Ligand binder design. Structure first.
Ligand code: NA
Ligand code: NA
Ligand code: NA
Length: 133
């Protein structure tokens, strides 16, 4: 769909307001870094994985094979108990609740390869500077 993209500090503010700062020991800057590399802060972001016919949705690009039901991914489990379309909304309460669920699993935020490649162990302070959070 056409993109619906957050202004960086507005996303930082929203996430903090939604309890993401320090959630599972994950700082806001880290959640910010993940959203940037996963979707560029685009809530309407979707990307089809041709291998297992699954799709990643929203600002955090959550996979339909394990977290949300998109009704078109074979052999899936809906661990967030959310329809994937709920992660393609301006209101990110669901995306947040689902992202919180993802990180409660053993690997935490390391679940996202992009976060391991672009964020992990690196200085991420740039993501929250100037946002007043
Ligand atoms: Na603005
Ligand atoms: Na503006
Ligand atoms: Na706000």
């Amino acid at each position: 769909a056409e993109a619906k993209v957050f202004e960086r500090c507005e996303l930082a503010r929203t996430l903090k307001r939604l309890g993401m700062d320090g959630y599972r020991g994950i700082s806001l800057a880290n959640w910010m870094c993940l959203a940037k590399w996963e979707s560029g802060y685009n809530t309407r972001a979707t990307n089809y994985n041709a291998g297992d016919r699954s799709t990643d949705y929203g600002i955090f690009q959550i996979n339909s094979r394990y977290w949300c039901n998109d009704g078109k991914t074979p052999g899936a489990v809906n661990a967030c108990h959310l329809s994937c379309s709920a992660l393609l909304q301006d209101n990110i309460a669901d995306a947040v609740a689902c992202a919180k669920r993802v990180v409660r699993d053993p690997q935490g935020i390391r679940a996202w390869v992009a976060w391991r490649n672009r964020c992990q162990n690196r200085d991420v302070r740039q993501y929250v500077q100037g946002c007043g959070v």
